[PDB]
Design a protein around this nucleic acid. Sequence first.
RNA 1: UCGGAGUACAAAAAACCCUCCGAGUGAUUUUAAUCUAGACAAACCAGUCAAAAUAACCCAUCACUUAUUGAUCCAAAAU
RNA 2: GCCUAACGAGCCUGGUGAUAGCUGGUUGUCCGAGAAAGAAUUUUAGUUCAACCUUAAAAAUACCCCAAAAAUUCCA
RNA 3: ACCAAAGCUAGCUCAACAUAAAUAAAAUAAAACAUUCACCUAACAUUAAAGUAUAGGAGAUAGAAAUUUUUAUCCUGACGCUAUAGAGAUAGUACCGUAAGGGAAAGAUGAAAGAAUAAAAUAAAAGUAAAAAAAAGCAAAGAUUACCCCUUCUACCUUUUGCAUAAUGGUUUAACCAGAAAAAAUCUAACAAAGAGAACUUUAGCUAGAUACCCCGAAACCA
Lengths: 76, 123, 224, 169, 60, 60
Amino acid sequence: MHNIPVYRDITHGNRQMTVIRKVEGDIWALQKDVEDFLSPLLGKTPVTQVNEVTGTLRVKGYFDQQLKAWLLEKGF
Amino acid sequence: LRSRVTDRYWRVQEVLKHARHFRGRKNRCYRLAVRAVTRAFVKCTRARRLKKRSLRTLWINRITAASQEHGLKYPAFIINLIKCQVELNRKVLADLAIYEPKTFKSLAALAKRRRXXXXXXXX
Amino acid sequence: XXXXXXXXXXXXXXXXXXXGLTELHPDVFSTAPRLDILHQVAIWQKNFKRISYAKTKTRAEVRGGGRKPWVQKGSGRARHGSIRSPIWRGGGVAHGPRGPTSYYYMLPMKVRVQGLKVALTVKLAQDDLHIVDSLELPTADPQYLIELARYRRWGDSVLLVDLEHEDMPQNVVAATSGLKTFNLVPAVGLNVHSMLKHQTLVLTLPTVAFLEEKLXXXXXXXXX
Amino acid sequence: XXXXXXXXXXXXXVSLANLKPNPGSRKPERRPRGRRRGRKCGRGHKGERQRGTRPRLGFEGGQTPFYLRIPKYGFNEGHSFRHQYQPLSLNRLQYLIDLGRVDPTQPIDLTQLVNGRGVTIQPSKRDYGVQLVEEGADTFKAKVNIEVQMASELAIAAIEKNGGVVTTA
Amino acid sequence: XXXXXXXXXXXXXXXXXXXXXXXXXXXXXXXXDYHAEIQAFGHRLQETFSLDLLKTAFVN
Amino acid sequence: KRKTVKAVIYRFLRLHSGLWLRRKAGYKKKLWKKTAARKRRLREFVFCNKTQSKLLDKMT
RNA sequence: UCGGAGUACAAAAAACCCUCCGAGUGAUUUUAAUCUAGACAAACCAGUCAAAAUAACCCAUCACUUAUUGAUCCAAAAU
RNA sequence: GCCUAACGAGCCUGGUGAUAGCUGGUUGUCCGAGAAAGAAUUUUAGUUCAACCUUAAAAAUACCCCAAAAAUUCCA
RNA sequence: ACCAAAGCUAGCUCAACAUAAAUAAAAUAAAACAUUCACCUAACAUUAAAGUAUAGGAGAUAGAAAUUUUUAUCCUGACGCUAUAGAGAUAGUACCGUAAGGGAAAGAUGAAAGAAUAAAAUAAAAGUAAAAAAAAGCAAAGAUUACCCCUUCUACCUUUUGCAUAAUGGUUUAACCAGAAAAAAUCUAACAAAGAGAACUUUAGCUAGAUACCCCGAAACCA
């Protein structure tokens, strides 16, 4: 199989946003880790979690490379 | 398929319930009842807005009368009350102008006193 | 890997026995049940069962003629065409149901499958799901079933999925005869509609076997 | 975490009456009846827009249409008689090698590529050929035989370089 | 349902031409007991004693 | 099902991204007084405006 | 339909059955070969300027300065 | 002129729910924002994109704008 | 309390199953019109090819074929409707026209007449009940008395730059009566380099659901 889901969301034609799906463990801790990781790099931490029956991690920027690398090396 | 059922009849019943005491078909027919109801509400708002104006004018007239009884007019009394730092409303002032002539007589005396003192200080 | 352990209580269903032990591992269980999927599945199941027999007659389908009732001008009356017009009390409706249709639609396999799966999870975690080794009804009478449901304190509505439909007459005969509380259905005929219809689920070992096989094969086919 | 929180509390057993959609799932369809937009149902005052007889699309109002002022070219002439060839990247191939698919030379063929869901269906394409456009070919795995209609120069290059076999039919 | 509202409108319209006399026992909707009344009577007013004499006071 | 307008299909070309392409008009005749550069640039292609490109998209 | 000068006072644009003149071209000599940036104007469609590279040499004047034309499909001297 | 009480071409039925850019009409509540003219058209009582406006998201910055300069056109 | 409403039942729509001769047009669409026009007269099954190959004042529009894929009976009714709905139908009657033809309206007591059991008696219309001291009123409201005079206000709707307008529509009441189309998109979910029930799409897509384009009217033409 392939490691982790990766959702590239398009709100409009020329506009792009990043979307992650819950895989292993609780979403809160991983979200905090995402904030702490993206804070020095981006300068800000615009991380938002949308949870109904499952969850969606949405941030402002493109971290997807670091996303895949992180969730790969971690193994979750 | 739906039905007209009692909905329209109940709405008409309500409007006609509010259409009571009206004259003629307006207390009977539905359409004229509505047309009269709209006007009734508009007149309600407008008259409730102008009620303060009517009461104010009436009070001003009464106070003007009670003032003219003492030899001074309404504007002079108003000015004197302003310089006397009196924030008393014209409603209570009119009530005193009716039931309690003594208080209004005192205020008029102080008014003439302030007017005479200002006219003597200006000269 | 989190392994869920469910206890299967074997009932010999004669009377006064709640004692039985079997270790079950229902990997079919889901963390959070989807209300949206379940609702869509229910709505769809309600949708494809619609006959769509509603019929009316548009002004063109009215038996009445298309002749003009009077002259256009000079008559003093209003301008009017055929009396089958919707403005006439002798006419029909234009926007009416008369034109037929089909209210059903094709729902993706993963959606309905995950629907049955999630529903099964709901019934599972709700304690309303019980697993047995087999089923016995030696006396085969309504009174026995009623007093059994009352003594064992089962749910108000219990859906029994046991048989493969090819055997065991003694059970089916009494179970399918004049019983509002209990409902019968083969293991291969198990559906989400039937589960959501009842407040309590009771399954046997072969039923759970075929069910978990079908659901694991569909989950493995949906994951791959 | 939600399983434990749902199993901890005793709910209403979720009767069919307790079924509710997620927020924003189904739209509250707008009905023209009301004082919100008066009597025109959003069609505006008069005009031909009000009528159901309103003019057809692709019409500029009687002035010379946009498409009529445009010259002609053989762009559409191609889509009919063109010979169809589908390019395939070596990255996809090495990806198939890394997916744990069939290793040996003999069974490998286009059919096996069909069964692996790695092929593009060409029902409307007559005389369908198979071509290979090079990409993702850096340090790709070795000893893999590939049989295609016509392979590009860099494709045959890349394949033969690592010891692969190119079969041209 | 339209039947319940038609029955309620008919009962409310029937009570206009017919006026029933006031009853003392059916006056209060909830059950009327001696202790409840004297308890509230004790909670409202400052001080209340002699429950027997109090009950006797309302007896005719 | 909808019928695509052939008038658009012939003289217009849609890419995979949804971009429309058309030939420059004016090259057909009366080139005697026209500059060779004009004809040269009229023999090339041009992309349609998004407003009209959408209209041509709905017809394809 | 188009161009110029006023109405339309020191970047644009701006009407009337307002007001002056001009065009569907006329002539004399050298000749405008291939295409890469980047802009003006512009609802659509039509119009202007053009560094620079390559191959081969080493457009211009009058009609005050600009005007002096025609978007599709269909025919022909032949491609 | 007449051809069954109205004949510049009868009446009945059917095509037919002919066509109408016109005219006469289009029903419950509350909240926020909120339009009067750029060129064309066998076109002026109609249309097609600009001049506006509304919804839902993103990346920017924008204006009132003084002296360097050409009532304005530009910019602290 | 008067004319009056309110209480039921016939009745049917649709799906499935059983069982003495001879090229019709035109109105219309292409906002005119002239070549042209899905459609209709008889034969013409599903998936996909495909709105493709082509045709067309190359305008509107029209539009395949080669080829592909398919399947055994037995299991009946209603998220169709009631005297304005559903067929017009208690009926092609009464009646109209020379004729062809056009075409209606119309029943309720109770288990039992055993003829006073019922239960409301409120829709527009007049009776029980008229204006009332020398006073003005798009018809009320604030005050005021258990009623009124005084003071404060230019009908509704439609059409318009603008209507109380002496511009339009309405006797009143009841009832009937006019926004039903998803491509691309926004949004809710399924899975994800794959989606989707052997059909298509796809440099984050794909699938499913949910969101926006109403009626009446000619003078005439043709058979």
